[PDB]
């Protein structure tokens, strides 16, 4: 690796690369940063904490014209793997986390191609706020979001956009979360129905605010209610319906009110069971609670 | 050369489908620029160097559930005078495993750990298994699971777009059998007793 060592020395030592400055010719220019999200696996959705835990891989693409070289002059080298701390980065963070972990988990190497394109695919474990609608529990569906933006840079400095596919005769933006059919396997309790992606821009917010721009990836997920059905609803419903037998019990048995009050006690035990599984929110009474 | 030593099977989480294990990830490779002649240095044939000071493979657990993706414990490497480096960092792997609960508590699971260089393809960095099986010589006994079988396989994938760029991984799989005595004693026997008591009302 005489050639890679020489190329790195040329790019960074000789030309005096400064990672603190953005890759622009003038300060008034903005850096285009394209983002895509791959959902490796949906770890969980905790209802009481109202928290979604996901494993995601964030594909970043941008251009750094200071990292350009003519490959023939450097042994036909076309791509370099570099530590991310050597180059300028677009400081994309998860805005709507609820644990203080704003950043990606593993800071993997950047791939720098000879034409100045920087490709970076860090993976991350994120814990995000997802308010829960308990109205139709356990037959409920939820709507979670992952809002990515920059706090160190505003819309004046970087322009966020979705990944643009350009392999065909018409380009198009990737407006969905990427799910690899070979590397993905569904969560045991949640099935993904929709998975859109959007670039949100606040017209009222000023350009020099971090809240002007964001890219949001949404997950509409449906609960698979088999567990709750089998282990709660059928026993509870059957035990509740069992109370109607008292009208067919003769009064001489001396066991009517005992049966009825015991059914009430069983329902109380079921209510104790269910109280530990949902948040104590006031938007609605859960269907099982109803 | 990549080898996996399984020290302990810490826990199997059937709800979130996560296997947490304690492992040692032995990695061996030659560094061309880190050679010397021992005669010129008093017969020193090996030294210990911080792992942060040298290039390393960027091995990542591809099927990580919610733990660390790569090595975070940067222990020292053993460097020989021939440039050979052995680095055996510890790790706690939290890996996704599709749990089939059909036969629970008499179920058998097949949990895998897929490892690969995240940013290097097979044309720049090649990984090979150290052995056909994970090293279980220092495995602590589990009170909940019995590992019936273990085996490491190397896989190479070439995409039709890029025929000269293979992407490599090594997958270590463990076929494990649950020990059902706890569930037999605590769950099945009381349920059987209630089932038996159900019929006594008719006498």
């Amino acid at each position, epitope marked *: 690796l005489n050639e890679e060592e020489r190329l790195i020395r040329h790019l960074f030592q000789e030309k005096g690369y400064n990672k603190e400055l953005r890759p*622009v*010719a*003038h300060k*008034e*220019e903005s850096v285009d940063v394209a983002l895509a999200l*791959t959902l490796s696996n949906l770890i969980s959705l905790k209802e009481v904490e109202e928290t979604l835990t996901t494993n995601v891989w964030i*594909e970043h*693409g941008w*251009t750094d*014209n200071r990292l350009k070289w003519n490959a023939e002059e450097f042994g036909n080298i076309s791509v370099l793997r570099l530590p991310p701390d050597m180059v300028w980065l677009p400081e994309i963070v998860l805005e709507n986390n609820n644990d203080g972990s704003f950043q990606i988990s593993y800071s993997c190497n950047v*791939l720098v*191609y000879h*034409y*100045g*394109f920087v*490709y970076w*695919l860090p993976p991350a474990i994120f814990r995000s706020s997802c308010p829960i609608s308990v109205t139709y529990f356990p037959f409920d569906w939820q709507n979670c979001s992952l809002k990515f933006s920059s706090l160190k840079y505003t819309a004046k400095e970087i322009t966020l956009s979705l*990944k*643009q*596919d*350009a*392999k*065909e*005769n*018409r*380009t198009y933006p990737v407006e969905w979360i*990427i799910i*690899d059919p070979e590397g993905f396997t569904e969560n045991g309790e949640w099935e993904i129905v929709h998975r859109p992606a959007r670039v949100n821009v606040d017209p009222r917010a000023p350009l020099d605010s971090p809240s002007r721009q964001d890219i949001t990836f949404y997950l509409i997920i449906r609960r698979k209610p088999l567990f709750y059905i089998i282990n709660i609803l059928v026993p509870c419903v059957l035990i509740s319906f069992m109370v109607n037998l008292v009208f067919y019990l003769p009064a001489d048995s001396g066991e009517k009110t005992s049966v009825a009050i015991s059914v009430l006690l069983a329902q109380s035990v079921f209510l104790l069971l269910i109280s530990k599984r949902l948040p104590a929110t006031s938007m609605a009474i859960p269907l099982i609670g109803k | 050369t990549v080898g996996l030593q399984l020290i302990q099977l810490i826990n199997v989480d059937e709800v979130n489908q996560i296997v947490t294990t304690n492992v040692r990830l032995k990695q061996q490779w030659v560094d061309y620029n880190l050679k010397w002649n021992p005669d010129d240095y008093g017969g020193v044939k090996k030294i210990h160097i911080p792992s942060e000071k040298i290039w390393r493979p960027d091995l990542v657990l591809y099927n990580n559930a919610d733990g660390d993706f790569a090595i975070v414990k940067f222990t020292k490497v053993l460097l020989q005078y021939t440039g050979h480096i052995t680095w055996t960092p510890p790790a706690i792997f939290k890996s996704y495993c599709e749990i089939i609960v059909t036969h629970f508590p008499f179920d058998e699971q097949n949990c895998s750990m897929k490892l690969g260089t995240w940013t290097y*393809d097979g044309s720049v960095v090649a990984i090979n298994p150290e052995s056909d099986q994970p090293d279980l010589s220092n495995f602590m006994e589990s009170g909940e699971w019995v590992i019936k079988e273990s085996r490491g396989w190397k896989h190479s994938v070439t*995409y039709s*777009c*890029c025929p000269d*760029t293979p*992407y490599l991984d090594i997958t270590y799989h463990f076929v494990m059998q649950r020990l059902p005595l706890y569930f037999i004693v605590n769950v099945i026997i009381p349920c059987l007793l209630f089932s038996f008591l159900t019929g006594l009302v008719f006498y």
Partner: antibody
Amino acid sequence: EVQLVQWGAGLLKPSETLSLTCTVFGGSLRANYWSWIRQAPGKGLEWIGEINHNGHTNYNPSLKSRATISVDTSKNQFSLRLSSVTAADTALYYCARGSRFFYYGAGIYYNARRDRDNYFDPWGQGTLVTVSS
Amino acid sequence: DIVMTQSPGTLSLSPGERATLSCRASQHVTGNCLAWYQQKPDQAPRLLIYDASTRATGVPDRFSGSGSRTDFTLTISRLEPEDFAVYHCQQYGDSPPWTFGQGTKVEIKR
């Protein structure tokens, strides 16, 4: 050494369709964008449109409705068709090589993009087009 | 979308003199993405400068590009007989459509 050779009928009548073809030697169409540029006598250069090897086109807004650019990779050629020509379309037409086009990634992350270097270093010899009745 | 205007129009200068050609953009040229071309009679345009300062291959040291933002300059230090041609500026920094200037002819002065 990339060379561009143009051909096509330069003498046309009003309301007809000009058709020009540019063939590339010493290189493939895969690596670049390829553009058509017209120069009227006593006027500046005007960019008509561009195409890449996948057939993705961009057009000048003033000529988009009448200009169609196509590519044929088997013969390493790209062609321009200008419909309903008038005397205002009399000009010297050039083909030229534009910005570099690159592929990156593997599997589902395989993608392509163009470099921000759309200057025209290699040009065709030029074809004089005259539209007269 | 971006209009390019070349100011001198015609430059009558003697051999051995210094020529200065100006190009003005109606909008900021991102990244200093400006190219200068030379066109002799009965010939296609030849790329002289790109990125507003970088000489193309085979271009003598007499040609030099400079400027930024919306004001760009091509300077010929010493004029030779072969340098009397039509010079064009072009912008490529802000997506298509790609636009040229109207051209500036450099004539010989007698």
